[PDB]
Design a protein around this ligand. Structure first.
Ligand SMILES: *[C@@H]1O[C@H](CO)[C@@H](O)[C@H](O)[C@H]1NC(C)=O
Lengths: 49, 274, 80, 99
Protein backbone atom coordinates (compact mmCIF):
# COMPACT_ATOMS: atom_id res chain seq x y z
CA UNK A 1 0.00 0.00 0.00
CA UNK A 2 1.08 3.54 -0.80
CA UNK A 3 -0.16 7.07 -0.22
CA UNK A 4 -0.84 9.76 -2.81
CA UNK A 5 -0.81 13.45 -1.90
CA UNK A 6 -1.83 16.36 -4.14
CA UNK A 7 -1.35 19.89 -2.77
CA UNK A 8 -1.44 23.39 -4.23
CA UNK A 9 0.74 26.38 -3.39
CA UNK A 10 0.35 29.89 -4.78
CA UNK A 11 0.67 33.44 -3.43
CA UNK A 12 1.20 32.31 0.15
CA UNK A 13 -1.77 29.94 0.16
CA UNK A 14 -1.66 26.15 0.38
CA UNK A 15 -4.31 23.45 0.27
CA UNK A 16 -4.31 19.67 0.59
CA UNK A 17 -6.35 19.00 -2.53
CA UNK A 18 -6.30 15.21 -2.31
CA UNK A 19 -5.06 12.43 -0.04
CA UNK A 20 -5.44 8.73 -0.80
CA UNK A 21 -3.99 5.45 0.49
CA UNK A 22 -4.73 2.79 -2.14
CA UNK A 23 -4.44 -0.73 -0.80
CA UNK A 24 -5.16 0.40 2.77
CA UNK A 25 -8.60 1.15 4.21
CA UNK A 26 -8.81 4.29 6.33
CA UNK A 27 -10.32 7.74 6.62
CA UNK A 28 -8.78 10.31 4.27
CA UNK A 29 -9.45 14.07 4.37
CA UNK A 30 -12.21 15.04 1.97
CA UNK A 31 -11.03 15.96 -1.51
CA UNK A 32 -11.30 19.64 -2.43
CA UNK A 33 -12.82 21.33 -5.49
CA UNK A 34 -14.40 18.05 -6.58
CA UNK A 35 -11.01 16.62 -7.51
CA UNK A 36 -10.36 12.91 -8.03
CA UNK A 37 -7.23 10.88 -8.75
CA UNK A 38 -6.53 7.67 -10.66
CA UNK A 39 -4.46 6.34 -7.76
CA UNK A 40 -3.83 2.61 -8.12
CA UNK A 41 -1.20 0.04 -8.96
CA UNK A 42 -1.20 -1.01 -12.61
CA UNK A 43 -1.21 -4.67 -11.51
CA UNK A 44 -1.39 -6.87 -8.42
CA UNK A 45 1.37 -9.31 -9.32
CA UNK A 46 3.04 -10.94 -6.29
CA UNK A 47 6.53 -9.71 -7.28
CA UNK A 48 7.90 -6.31 -8.21
CA UNK A 49 8.83 -3.97 -9.69
CA UNK B 1 -3.82 -11.01 -75.89
CA UNK B 2 -2.68 -12.13 -72.44
CA UNK B 3 -3.22 -15.87 -71.97
CA UNK B 4 -2.97 -18.12 -68.93
CA UNK B 5 -2.71 -21.75 -67.89
CA UNK B 6 -3.99 -22.87 -64.49
CA UNK B 7 -4.20 -26.20 -62.67
CA UNK B 8 -6.59 -26.55 -59.72
CA UNK B 9 -6.76 -29.40 -57.21
CA UNK B 10 -9.56 -29.46 -54.65
CA UNK B 11 -10.16 -32.03 -51.91
CA UNK B 12 -13.46 -31.73 -50.02
CA UNK B 13 -13.94 -33.97 -47.00
CA UNK B 14 -17.39 -35.55 -46.58
CA UNK B 15 -17.64 -36.85 -43.01
CA UNK B 16 -19.94 -39.83 -42.66
CA UNK B 17 -20.22 -40.06 -46.46
CA UNK B 18 -16.98 -41.75 -47.56
CA UNK B 19 -13.50 -40.47 -48.27
CA UNK B 20 -12.88 -36.88 -49.40
CA UNK B 21 -13.80 -36.02 -52.98
CA UNK B 22 -10.82 -34.96 -55.12
CA UNK B 23 -11.15 -32.90 -58.31
CA UNK B 24 -8.35 -31.77 -60.64
CA UNK B 25 -8.89 -29.36 -63.53
CA UNK B 26 -6.77 -27.59 -66.12
CA UNK B 27 -7.75 -24.28 -67.73
CA UNK B 28 -6.33 -22.31 -70.63
CA UNK B 29 -7.94 -18.86 -70.50
CA UNK B 30 -10.73 -20.17 -68.26
CA UNK B 31 -11.40 -22.97 -70.78
CA UNK B 32 -11.27 -26.45 -69.28
CA UNK B 33 -9.19 -29.03 -71.15
CA UNK B 34 -8.71 -31.81 -68.55
CA UNK B 35 -10.70 -33.01 -65.56
CA UNK B 36 -10.28 -35.78 -62.99
CA UNK B 37 -13.06 -36.55 -60.52
CA UNK B 38 -12.93 -39.29 -57.90
CA UNK B 39 -16.75 -39.43 -57.80
CA UNK B 40 -16.70 -40.33 -61.50
CA UNK B 41 -17.76 -43.86 -62.42
CA UNK B 42 -14.28 -44.66 -63.82
CA UNK B 43 -11.82 -42.26 -62.14
CA UNK B 44 -9.59 -41.16 -65.00
CA UNK B 45 -8.11 -37.92 -66.30
CA UNK B 46 -10.28 -37.12 -69.31
CA UNK B 47 -9.67 -34.50 -72.01
CA UNK B 48 -12.33 -31.82 -72.36
CA UNK B 49 -10.95 -29.76 -75.28
CA UNK B 50 -10.25 -31.02 -78.84
CA UNK B 51 -7.26 -28.66 -79.16
CA UNK B 52 -5.33 -30.63 -76.52
CA UNK B 53 -2.18 -32.55 -77.50
CA UNK B 54 -3.33 -36.13 -77.09
CA UNK B 55 -0.43 -38.58 -76.80
CA UNK B 56 -2.02 -42.01 -76.41
CA UNK B 57 -3.87 -43.84 -73.63
CA UNK B 58 -0.60 -44.55 -71.81
CA UNK B 59 -0.17 -40.86 -70.98
CA UNK B 60 -3.76 -40.71 -69.73
CA UNK B 61 -3.18 -43.70 -67.46
CA UNK B 62 -0.01 -42.06 -66.12
CA UNK B 63 -1.92 -38.85 -65.39
CA UNK B 64 -4.68 -40.87 -63.71
CA UNK B 65 -2.11 -42.48 -61.41
CA UNK B 66 -0.53 -39.09 -60.70
CA UNK B 67 -3.89 -37.61 -59.73
CA UNK B 68 -4.74 -40.59 -57.53
CA UNK B 69 -1.45 -40.07 -55.70
CA UNK B 70 -2.31 -36.38 -55.35
CA UNK B 71 -5.70 -37.40 -53.96
CA UNK B 72 -4.05 -39.51 -51.26
CA UNK B 73 -1.65 -36.68 -50.43
CA UNK B 74 -4.53 -34.21 -50.17
CA UNK B 75 -6.48 -36.56 -47.89
CA UNK B 76 -3.47 -36.76 -45.58
CA UNK B 77 -3.06 -32.97 -45.66
CA UNK B 78 -6.77 -32.50 -44.92
CA UNK B 79 -6.50 -34.70 -41.84
CA UNK B 80 -3.34 -32.91 -40.70
CA UNK B 81 -4.87 -29.44 -41.06
CA UNK B 82 -8.11 -30.52 -39.39
CA UNK B 83 -6.08 -31.76 -36.44
CA UNK B 84 -3.93 -28.64 -36.23
CA UNK B 85 -6.86 -26.20 -36.36
CA UNK B 86 -8.68 -28.04 -33.54
CA UNK B 87 -11.77 -28.69 -35.66
CA UNK B 88 -14.39 -31.37 -35.12
CA UNK B 89 -14.45 -34.51 -37.27
CA UNK B 90 -18.09 -33.76 -38.17
CA UNK B 91 -17.78 -30.67 -40.37
CA UNK B 92 -16.71 -30.42 -43.99
CA UNK B 93 -13.42 -28.76 -44.96
CA UNK B 94 -11.69 -28.18 -48.29
CA UNK B 95 -8.06 -27.98 -49.38
CA UNK B 96 -7.18 -26.22 -52.64
CA UNK B 97 -3.94 -26.00 -54.62
CA UNK B 98 -3.48 -23.85 -57.72
CA UNK B 99 -0.41 -23.57 -59.91
CA UNK B 100 0.11 -22.10 -63.34
CA UNK B 101 1.62 -19.42 -65.53
CA UNK B 102 0.41 -16.26 -67.28
CA UNK B 103 1.92 -15.27 -70.62
CA UNK B 104 1.70 -12.07 -72.62
CA UNK B 105 0.74 -11.61 -76.25
CA UNK B 106 4.36 -12.27 -77.29
CA UNK B 107 4.52 -15.59 -75.43
CA UNK B 108 6.75 -14.28 -72.62
CA UNK B 109 6.14 -15.18 -68.98
CA UNK B 110 4.55 -12.55 -66.74
CA UNK B 111 3.46 -14.21 -63.48
CA UNK B 112 3.83 -17.74 -62.15
CA UNK B 113 1.55 -18.99 -59.39
CA UNK B 114 1.82 -21.83 -56.87
CA UNK B 115 -0.60 -21.37 -53.96
CA UNK B 116 -2.43 -23.45 -51.38
CA UNK B 117 -5.55 -22.45 -49.44
CA UNK B 118 -7.50 -24.12 -46.63
CA UNK B 119 -11.25 -23.50 -46.22
CA UNK B 120 -11.07 -20.78 -48.87
CA UNK B 121 -8.44 -18.76 -47.00
CA UNK B 122 -4.87 -18.36 -48.20
CA UNK B 123 -2.55 -20.89 -46.57
CA UNK B 124 0.77 -20.43 -48.38
CA UNK B 125 1.57 -18.75 -51.70
CA UNK B 126 4.67 -18.37 -53.84
CA UNK B 127 5.44 -14.67 -54.23
CA UNK B 128 5.77 -12.76 -57.49
CA UNK B 129 9.58 -12.93 -57.35
CA UNK B 130 9.31 -16.75 -57.36
CA UNK B 131 11.83 -16.91 -54.49
CA UNK B 132 9.99 -16.39 -51.19
CA UNK B 133 6.66 -17.50 -49.73
CA UNK B 134 3.87 -15.83 -47.75
CA UNK B 135 2.61 -17.75 -44.72
CA UNK B 136 0.44 -16.30 -41.95
CA UNK B 137 -0.16 -19.34 -39.72
CA UNK B 138 2.39 -21.33 -37.73
CA UNK B 139 1.84 -24.54 -39.71
CA UNK B 140 2.11 -22.53 -42.93
CA UNK B 141 5.36 -21.06 -41.60
CA UNK B 142 6.68 -24.53 -40.72
CA UNK B 143 6.09 -25.70 -44.28
CA UNK B 144 7.50 -22.41 -45.60
CA UNK B 145 10.76 -22.87 -43.69
CA UNK B 146 10.92 -26.51 -44.79
CA UNK B 147 10.61 -25.44 -48.43
CA UNK B 148 13.13 -22.61 -48.02
CA UNK B 149 15.64 -25.06 -46.56
CA UNK B 150 14.91 -27.50 -49.40
CA UNK B 151 15.09 -24.81 -52.14
CA UNK B 152 11.72 -25.77 -53.62
CA UNK B 153 11.17 -22.32 -55.13
CA UNK B 154 14.10 -23.01 -57.46
CA UNK B 155 12.48 -26.10 -58.97
CA UNK B 156 9.07 -24.44 -59.08
CA UNK B 157 10.49 -21.42 -60.90
CA UNK B 158 12.33 -23.67 -63.35
CA UNK B 159 9.07 -25.47 -64.12
CA UNK B 160 6.95 -22.31 -64.36
CA UNK B 161 9.43 -20.54 -66.64
CA UNK B 162 9.97 -23.75 -68.63
CA UNK B 163 7.48 -26.54 -69.26
CA UNK B 164 4.51 -24.38 -68.23
CA UNK B 165 5.10 -21.76 -70.92
CA UNK B 166 6.01 -24.40 -73.51
CA UNK B 167 2.75 -26.29 -72.94
CA UNK B 168 0.74 -23.06 -72.92
CA UNK B 169 2.25 -22.04 -76.27
CA UNK B 170 1.61 -25.51 -77.70
CA UNK B 171 -2.03 -25.41 -76.57
CA UNK B 172 -2.54 -21.91 -77.97
CA UNK B 173 -1.02 -22.95 -81.31
CA UNK B 174 -3.19 -26.08 -81.48
CA UNK B 175 -6.25 -24.00 -80.57
CA UNK B 176 -6.01 -20.95 -82.81
CA UNK B 177 -9.64 -21.45 -83.84
CA UNK B 178 -11.03 -20.84 -80.33
CA UNK B 179 -8.31 -19.83 -77.87
CA UNK B 180 -6.99 -17.10 -80.21
CA UNK B 181 -10.22 -15.65 -81.63
CA UNK B 182 -11.76 -12.24 -80.96
CA UNK B 183 -15.53 -11.87 -81.36
CA UNK B 184 -16.46 -8.16 -81.29
CA UNK B 185 -19.41 -7.27 -79.05
CA UNK B 186 -22.86 -6.49 -80.39
CA UNK B 187 -23.81 -3.24 -78.65
CA UNK B 188 -27.10 -1.45 -78.11
CA UNK B 189 -28.57 1.16 -75.76
CA UNK B 190 -31.95 0.85 -74.03
CA UNK B 191 -34.01 3.56 -72.32
CA UNK B 192 -36.17 2.90 -69.25
CA UNK B 193 -38.31 5.68 -67.71
CA UNK B 194 -37.61 5.26 -63.99
CA UNK B 195 -39.41 8.38 -62.70
CA UNK B 196 -41.32 11.45 -63.83
CA UNK B 197 -38.03 13.38 -64.12
CA UNK B 198 -35.38 10.65 -64.55
CA UNK B 199 -34.64 7.68 -66.80
CA UNK B 200 -32.09 4.87 -67.07
CA UNK B 201 -29.78 4.38 -70.05
CA UNK B 202 -28.36 0.85 -70.25
CA UNK B 203 -25.56 -0.11 -72.64
CA UNK B 204 -25.54 -3.81 -73.57
CA UNK B 205 -22.53 -5.64 -75.00
CA UNK B 206 -23.46 -9.18 -76.08
CA UNK B 207 -21.65 -12.07 -77.70
CA UNK B 208 -18.03 -10.98 -77.22
CA UNK B 209 -14.98 -13.16 -76.61
CA UNK B 210 -12.69 -13.02 -74.65
CA UNK B 211 -14.27 -11.71 -71.42
CA UNK B 212 -12.02 -8.62 -71.16
CA UNK B 213 -14.29 -5.69 -72.07
CA UNK B 214 -14.64 -2.10 -70.87
CA UNK B 215 -17.90 -0.12 -70.82
CA UNK B 216 -17.91 3.52 -69.70
CA UNK B 217 -20.57 6.24 -69.70
CA UNK B 218 -19.45 9.78 -70.50
CA UNK B 219 -21.50 12.96 -70.04
CA UNK B 220 -20.47 15.84 -72.31
CA UNK B 221 -17.41 13.87 -73.37
CA UNK B 222 -16.14 13.38 -69.80
CA UNK B 223 -16.11 10.26 -67.65
CA UNK B 224 -19.25 9.58 -65.62
CA UNK B 225 -17.69 7.38 -62.95
CA UNK B 226 -20.31 8.58 -60.46
CA UNK B 227 -23.38 6.35 -60.06
CA UNK B 228 -22.56 4.07 -62.99
CA UNK B 229 -24.01 0.65 -62.21
CA UNK B 230 -22.31 -2.46 -63.59
CA UNK B 231 -22.94 -6.20 -63.68
CA UNK B 232 -20.17 -8.76 -63.70
CA UNK B 233 -19.32 -10.27 -67.07
CA UNK B 234 -21.31 -13.47 -67.45
CA UNK B 235 -21.21 -16.43 -69.86
CA UNK B 236 -23.88 -16.44 -72.54
CA UNK B 237 -23.63 -20.25 -72.52
CA UNK B 238 -22.19 -20.61 -76.04
CA UNK B 239 -18.54 -19.57 -75.44
CA UNK B 240 -19.33 -15.82 -75.56
CA UNK B 241 -19.99 -13.27 -72.82
CA UNK B 242 -22.57 -10.62 -71.93
CA UNK B 243 -22.37 -7.39 -69.97
CA UNK B 244 -24.24 -4.15 -69.45
CA UNK B 245 -23.60 -0.80 -67.79
CA UNK B 246 -26.39 1.50 -66.61
CA UNK B 247 -26.58 5.19 -65.74
CA UNK B 248 -29.41 7.37 -64.42
CA UNK B 249 -30.03 10.52 -66.46
CA UNK B 250 -32.39 13.52 -66.20
CA UNK B 251 -35.34 13.25 -68.55
CA UNK B 252 -34.65 15.07 -71.81
CA UNK B 253 -30.87 15.11 -71.29
CA UNK B 254 -30.20 11.62 -72.69
CA UNK B 255 -28.73 13.20 -75.84
CA UNK B 256 -25.62 14.23 -73.85
CA UNK B 257 -24.60 10.72 -72.71
CA UNK B 258 -22.31 8.41 -74.69
CA UNK B 259 -21.52 4.76 -74.00
CA UNK B 260 -17.91 3.82 -74.80
CA UNK B 261 -17.00 0.21 -75.56
CA UNK B 262 -13.44 -1.15 -75.63
CA UNK B 263 -12.79 -4.74 -76.71
CA UNK B 264 -10.12 -6.54 -78.72
CA UNK B 265 -12.64 -7.50 -81.40
CA UNK B 266 -13.42 -3.85 -82.11
CA UNK B 267 -10.74 -2.23 -84.31
CA UNK B 268 -11.64 1.07 -82.63
CA UNK B 269 -13.60 1.87 -79.46
CA UNK B 270 -17.33 2.16 -80.12
CA UNK B 271 -19.48 5.15 -79.17
CA UNK B 272 -23.22 4.63 -78.67
CA UNK B 273 -25.78 7.44 -78.34
CA UNK B 274 -29.42 6.55 -77.67
CA UNK C 1 -1.13 -9.29 -16.63
CA UNK C 2 -0.90 -13.08 -16.81
CA UNK C 3 2.04 -14.62 -14.98
CA UNK C 4 2.09 -17.69 -17.26
CA UNK C 5 1.00 -18.14 -20.88
CA UNK C 6 -0.11 -21.61 -21.93
CA UNK C 7 1.37 -22.48 -25.31
CA UNK C 8 1.26 -25.27 -27.89
CA UNK C 9 4.56 -26.57 -29.26
CA UNK C 10 4.02 -27.59 -32.89
CA UNK C 11 6.32 -30.27 -34.29
CA UNK C 12 8.41 -29.06 -37.23
CA UNK C 13 9.80 -32.47 -38.18
CA UNK C 14 8.16 -34.11 -41.18
CA UNK C 15 6.19 -37.28 -40.54
CA UNK C 16 4.99 -35.91 -37.20
CA UNK C 17 2.13 -34.08 -38.89
CA UNK C 18 1.51 -30.98 -36.79
CA UNK C 19 1.23 -32.72 -33.44
CA UNK C 20 0.92 -30.21 -30.60
CA UNK C 21 2.41 -30.62 -27.13
CA UNK C 22 1.60 -28.58 -24.01
CA UNK C 23 4.04 -25.96 -22.81
CA UNK C 24 4.16 -22.80 -20.75
CA UNK C 25 5.89 -19.42 -20.86
CA UNK C 26 6.60 -18.17 -17.33
CA UNK C 27 7.10 -14.48 -18.06
CA UNK C 28 8.33 -13.40 -14.60
CA UNK C 29 10.38 -15.93 -12.64
CA UNK C 30 10.14 -13.92 -9.43
CA UNK C 31 12.08 -14.74 -6.26
CA UNK C 32 12.01 -18.43 -5.41
CA UNK C 33 11.60 -21.52 -7.54
CA UNK C 34 9.08 -21.46 -10.41
CA UNK C 35 5.64 -23.03 -10.00
CA UNK C 36 6.22 -26.77 -10.48
CA UNK C 37 4.70 -28.13 -13.70
CA UNK C 38 5.25 -31.90 -13.75
CA UNK C 39 2.58 -32.18 -16.46
CA UNK C 40 4.71 -30.14 -18.88
CA UNK C 41 7.79 -31.36 -20.68
CA UNK C 42 10.82 -29.64 -19.09
CA UNK C 43 11.98 -28.36 -22.49
CA UNK C 44 8.62 -26.72 -23.27
CA UNK C 45 8.40 -24.90 -19.90
CA UNK C 46 10.30 -21.65 -20.46
CA UNK C 47 11.30 -18.98 -17.95
CA UNK C 48 11.39 -15.90 -20.17
CA UNK C 49 14.07 -13.23 -19.78
CA UNK C 50 13.45 -10.10 -21.87
CA UNK C 51 16.27 -7.52 -21.87
CA UNK C 52 14.35 -5.23 -24.23
CA UNK C 53 11.11 -5.68 -22.29
CA UNK C 54 8.76 -5.59 -25.28
CA UNK C 55 7.09 -8.90 -24.43
CA UNK C 56 7.02 -8.18 -20.69
CA UNK C 57 5.52 -4.71 -21.19
CA UNK C 58 3.07 -6.08 -23.76
CA UNK C 59 1.72 -8.57 -21.22
CA UNK C 60 2.04 -6.35 -18.14
CA UNK C 61 -0.82 -4.04 -19.18
CA UNK C 62 -2.98 -6.83 -20.61
CA UNK C 63 -6.65 -6.00 -19.90
CA UNK C 64 -8.03 -7.69 -16.81
CA UNK C 65 -10.91 -10.10 -17.31
CA UNK C 66 -9.84 -10.95 -20.86
CA UNK C 67 -9.57 -14.31 -22.65
CA UNK C 68 -6.26 -16.13 -22.53
CA UNK C 69 -4.11 -15.36 -25.59
CA UNK C 70 -3.44 -18.09 -28.15
CA UNK C 71 0.25 -19.03 -28.02
CA UNK C 72 2.23 -21.39 -30.25
CA UNK C 73 5.90 -22.36 -30.08
CA UNK C 74 7.98 -23.94 -32.81
CA UNK C 75 11.61 -24.74 -33.53
CA UNK C 76 13.45 -22.15 -35.60
CA UNK C 77 16.64 -22.43 -37.66
CA UNK C 78 18.14 -19.09 -38.77
CA UNK C 79 18.15 -18.84 -42.56
CA UNK C 80 18.92 -15.92 -44.88
CA UNK D 1 -14.26 -18.39 -44.37
CA UNK D 2 -17.61 -18.76 -46.14
CA UNK D 3 -18.87 -16.67 -49.06
CA UNK D 4 -22.47 -16.29 -50.22
CA UNK D 5 -23.24 -17.08 -53.87
CA UNK D 6 -23.87 -14.22 -56.27
CA UNK D 7 -26.77 -14.89 -58.63
CA UNK D 8 -27.60 -13.51 -62.06
CA UNK D 9 -30.63 -14.61 -64.10
CA UNK D 10 -30.65 -13.75 -67.81
CA UNK D 11 -31.14 -15.18 -71.30
CA UNK D 12 -28.62 -16.27 -73.92
CA UNK D 13 -30.19 -13.88 -76.45
CA UNK D 14 -32.40 -10.79 -76.14
CA UNK D 15 -35.84 -12.09 -75.25
CA UNK D 16 -38.47 -12.13 -78.00
CA UNK D 17 -41.97 -13.42 -77.32
CA UNK D 18 -42.59 -16.68 -79.14
CA UNK D 19 -38.89 -17.20 -79.91
CA UNK D 20 -36.94 -20.15 -78.49
CA UNK D 21 -34.11 -19.16 -76.16
CA UNK D 22 -32.07 -20.33 -73.17
CA UNK D 23 -32.59 -19.10 -69.60
CA UNK D 24 -29.35 -19.00 -67.61
CA UNK D 25 -28.77 -18.71 -63.89
CA UNK D 26 -25.12 -17.91 -63.25
CA UNK D 27 -24.04 -18.59 -59.65
CA UNK D 28 -20.55 -17.49 -58.69
CA UNK D 29 -18.20 -16.68 -55.86
CA UNK D 30 -19.45 -19.08 -53.18
CA UNK D 31 -17.53 -21.19 -50.68
CA UNK D 32 -17.81 -24.07 -49.80
CA UNK D 33 -18.87 -25.76 -53.06
CA UNK D 34 -22.15 -27.34 -51.90
CA UNK D 35 -25.01 -25.36 -53.44
CA UNK D 36 -28.59 -26.00 -54.56
CA UNK D 37 -29.97 -24.19 -57.62
CA UNK D 38 -33.41 -24.36 -59.23
CA UNK D 39 -35.00 -22.51 -62.14
CA UNK D 40 -38.62 -21.58 -61.41
CA UNK D 41 -41.37 -20.91 -63.97
CA UNK D 42 -44.30 -19.26 -62.16
CA UNK D 43 -42.97 -20.79 -58.94
CA UNK D 44 -42.97 -24.37 -60.19
CA UNK D 45 -39.63 -26.12 -60.66
CA UNK D 46 -38.46 -26.71 -64.22
CA UNK D 47 -37.55 -30.38 -64.65
CA UNK D 48 -35.16 -30.47 -67.63
CA UNK D 49 -32.46 -28.12 -66.34
CA UNK D 50 -28.86 -28.69 -67.41
CA UNK D 51 -25.72 -27.23 -65.88
CA UNK D 52 -21.97 -27.07 -66.39
CA UNK D 53 -19.26 -28.75 -64.34
CA UNK D 54 -18.23 -27.14 -61.08
CA UNK D 55 -15.60 -24.55 -61.97
CA UNK D 56 -12.76 -23.04 -59.96
CA UNK D 57 -11.68 -19.41 -59.70
CA UNK D 58 -8.25 -18.02 -58.87
CA UNK D 59 -9.60 -16.63 -55.57
CA UNK D 60 -10.66 -20.05 -54.18
CA UNK D 61 -14.37 -19.67 -55.00
CA UNK D 62 -16.59 -21.76 -57.27
CA UNK D 63 -19.17 -21.02 -59.94
CA UNK D 64 -21.81 -22.82 -62.00
CA UNK D 65 -24.17 -22.14 -64.89
CA UNK D 66 -27.68 -23.63 -65.01
CA UNK D 67 -29.37 -23.34 -68.40
CA UNK D 68 -32.77 -24.42 -69.68
CA UNK D 69 -34.51 -24.00 -73.03
CA UNK D 70 -37.66 -21.88 -72.92
CA UNK D 71 -39.80 -19.62 -75.09
CA UNK D 72 -40.34 -16.30 -73.28
CA UNK D 73 -43.86 -14.89 -73.35
CA UNK D 74 -45.84 -12.35 -71.38
CA UNK D 75 -47.66 -13.56 -68.24
CA UNK D 76 -44.82 -16.10 -67.69
CA UNK D 77 -42.44 -15.40 -64.81
CA UNK D 78 -39.01 -16.98 -64.43
CA UNK D 79 -36.73 -16.82 -61.40
CA UNK D 80 -33.66 -18.51 -59.95
CA UNK D 81 -33.84 -20.01 -56.45
CA UNK D 82 -30.53 -20.64 -54.68
CA UNK D 83 -29.82 -22.31 -51.34
CA UNK D 84 -26.39 -22.26 -49.70
CA UNK D 85 -24.99 -22.90 -46.23
CA UNK D 86 -24.55 -19.12 -45.85
CA UNK D 87 -28.25 -18.38 -46.54
CA UNK D 88 -30.76 -18.75 -43.72
CA UNK D 89 -33.52 -19.26 -46.31
CA UNK D 90 -33.39 -19.79 -50.08
CA UNK D 91 -32.98 -16.60 -52.09
CA UNK D 92 -35.04 -16.14 -55.25
CA UNK D 93 -33.90 -13.56 -57.82
CA UNK D 94 -36.40 -12.64 -60.52
CA UNK D 95 -35.62 -12.54 -64.24
CA UNK D 96 -36.08 -9.24 -66.06
CA UNK D 97 -35.67 -9.04 -69.83
CA UNK D 98 -33.56 -5.88 -69.33
CA UNK D 99 -31.14 -7.08 -66.65
C1 LIG E 1 -9.49 -27.47 -28.72
O1 LIG E 1 -10.51 -26.64 -28.21
C2 LIG E 1 -11.08 -27.12 -27.01
C3 LIG E 1 -12.28 -26.27 -26.67
O2 LIG E 1 -11.86 -25.00 -26.24
C4 LIG E 1 -10.01 -27.10 -25.91
O3 LIG E 1 -10.50 -27.66 -24.71
C5 LIG E 1 -8.82 -27.94 -26.35
O4 LIG E 1 -7.74 -27.81 -25.46
C6 LIG E 1 -8.33 -27.50 -27.72
N1 LIG E 1 -7.28 -28.38 -28.17
C7 LIG E 1 -6.11 -27.97 -28.67
C8 LIG E 1 -5.17 -29.08 -29.07
O5 LIG E 1 -5.81 -26.80 -28.81
Amino acid sequence: PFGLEWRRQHLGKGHLLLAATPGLNGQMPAAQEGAVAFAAWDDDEPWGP
Amino acid sequence: GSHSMRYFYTSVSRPGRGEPRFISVGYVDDTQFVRFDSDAASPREEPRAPWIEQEGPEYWDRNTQIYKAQAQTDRESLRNLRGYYNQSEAGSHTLQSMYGCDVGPDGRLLRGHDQYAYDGKDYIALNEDLRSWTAADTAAQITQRKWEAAREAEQRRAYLEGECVEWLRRYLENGKDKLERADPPKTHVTHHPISDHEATLRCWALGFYPAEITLTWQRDGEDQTQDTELVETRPAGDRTFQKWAAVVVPSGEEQRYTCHVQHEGLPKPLTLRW
Amino acid sequence: GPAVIECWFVEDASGKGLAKRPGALLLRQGPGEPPPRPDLDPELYLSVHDPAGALQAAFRRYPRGAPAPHCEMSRFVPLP
Amino acid sequence: IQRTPKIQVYSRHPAENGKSNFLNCYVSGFHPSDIEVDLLKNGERIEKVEHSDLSFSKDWSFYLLYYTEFTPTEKDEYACRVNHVTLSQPKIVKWDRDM
